[PDB]
Structure formats: C-alpha cells, structure tokens
Design an enzyme around this catalytic site. Structure first.
Site, mmCIF file in Angstrom:
data_model
loop_
_atom_site.group_PDB
_atom_site.id
_atom_site.type_symbol
_atom_site.label_atom_id
_atom_site.label_comp_id
_atom_site.label_asym_id
_atom_site.label_seq_id
_atom_site.Cartn_x
_atom_site.Cartn_y
_atom_site.Cartn_z
ATOM 1 N N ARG A 194 0.536 -1.096 -0.170
ATOM 2 C CA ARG A 194 0.526 0.487 0.268
ATOM 3 C C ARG A 194 1.099 1.501 -0.265
ATOM 4 O O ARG A 194 1.824 1.595 1.177
ATOM 5 C CB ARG A 194 -0.955 -0.026 1.270
ATOM 6 N N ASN A 252 -1.531 -0.264 12.084
ATOM 7 C CA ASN A 252 -2.997 -1.447 12.838
ATOM 8 C C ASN A 252 -4.451 -2.106 11.968
ATOM 9 O O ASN A 252 -4.751 -1.098 11.483
ATOM 10 C CB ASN A 252 -2.914 -0.974 14.052
ATOM 11 N N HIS A 306 -2.083 5.168 15.992
ATOM 12 C CA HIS A 306 -1.010 4.524 15.308
ATOM 13 C C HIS A 306 -0.572 5.125 15.698
ATOM 14 O O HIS A 306 0.708 6.406 16.650
ATOM 15 C CB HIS A 306 -0.816 4.794 13.769
#
Lengths: 6, 164
Positions: free
Chosen positions: B54, B101, B125
């Site tokens: 990603r 996460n 995060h």
C-alpha cells in the site's frame, strides 16, 4: 485489514 | 543506544536505494524491538523479501505484511499481535515510522513510512521510529504508488538489518 487512512 | 536499521529498496528487482531508520526503543521498547528484530530476521520470518503493498503519494508507504502481502495478517515476534505501547510520539512529518494497525491494540508486523505530516493518526497509530537517511528513496518509490495504494511497480525490501 490493517493500515492508516487520510 | 537507539537502534538503527535499514531497508534496501528495489523497484521490480532493480535496486533503488537504502533507507535507514532510528527506532525509539527508549520510548517505545516492545514496538521498537519488534521492528528491529523483524528488520534483521532474528526469527526466520521478517521484512526481508516482503513488499510495500500500500503506497499513497502525499500520505504514506505501508509494508510489513510478510505473510499475506496484502494487509490482512503479517505477525510480530510475540506470536501474532500486541497492544499499543503508547502515543507519546506524533506524526510530525515525512520520514515518520508508525505502526499500521487494524483497530486499537492490534500492532503486528505492519508499518508505514510517512511522506507528510499526518497528525490525524496521532493517538490511533504508535509512532516508534523515523527515517535517518534515504528519504529520497522513500520518495522515489512513492511515485510508484496510487490513490488506493495499489503499486504500479513491485517495490520490495531487497535487503535489511541493524547498523547499530
């Protein structure tokens, strides 16, 4: 599903 | 004392460059030692060979899913996942290394490198490291990303480990 979003 | 590790990035097999990070083990120990141990490969799995599934230009580059290579699983050094260490450190800008996460207290192996200030992720995060050198490599592989995070080329961690 993992990951940061804007 | 803060560990320094690195990633040798490649775009479709062809070596792109090196990116090194400082891991704040002094603030985020379990989280830092997790990334450190996965960068070297101190357990047989790790970030070697894995890719950045990603990548979103102006946002971040996410990798760490060595098991699925999509964002589904991956795994830490403590079995599967672990809780959030804390949120002391914030997403101040590019180079920031944070844990990727799937809801509070589910930190596994996945992480993302920031390429912009992402303060909206602060508290969600765990920020545990930052690029020391190679922010131009991270930026080069960023162009091979997209809007949905699909990578127009296969960006891989050709090699990795600890320099101190």
């Amino acid at each position: 599903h993992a990951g940061p979003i804007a | 004392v803060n560990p320094t590790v690195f990633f040798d990035i490649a775009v479709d097999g062809e070596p792109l460059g090196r990116v090194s990070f400082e891991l704040f083990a002094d603030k985020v120990p379990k989280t830092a030692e997790n990334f450190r141990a996965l960068s070297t490969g101190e357990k047989g799995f790790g970030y070697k060979g894995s890719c950045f599934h990603r990548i979103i230009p102006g946002f971040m580059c996410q990798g760490g899913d060595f098991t699925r290579h999509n964002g589904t699983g991956g795994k830490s050094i403590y079995g599967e996942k672990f809780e959030d260490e804390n949120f002391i450190l914030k997403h101040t800008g590019p180079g920031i290394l944070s844990m990727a996460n799937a809801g509070p207290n589910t930190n596994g192996s996945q992480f993302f490198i920031c390429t912009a200030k992402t303060e909206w992720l602060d508290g969600k995060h765990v920020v545990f490291g930052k690029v020391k050198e190679g922010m131009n490599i991270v930026e080069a592989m960023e162009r091979f990303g997209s809007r949905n995070g699909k990578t127009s080329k296969k960006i891989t961690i050709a090699d990795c480990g600890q320099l101190e």
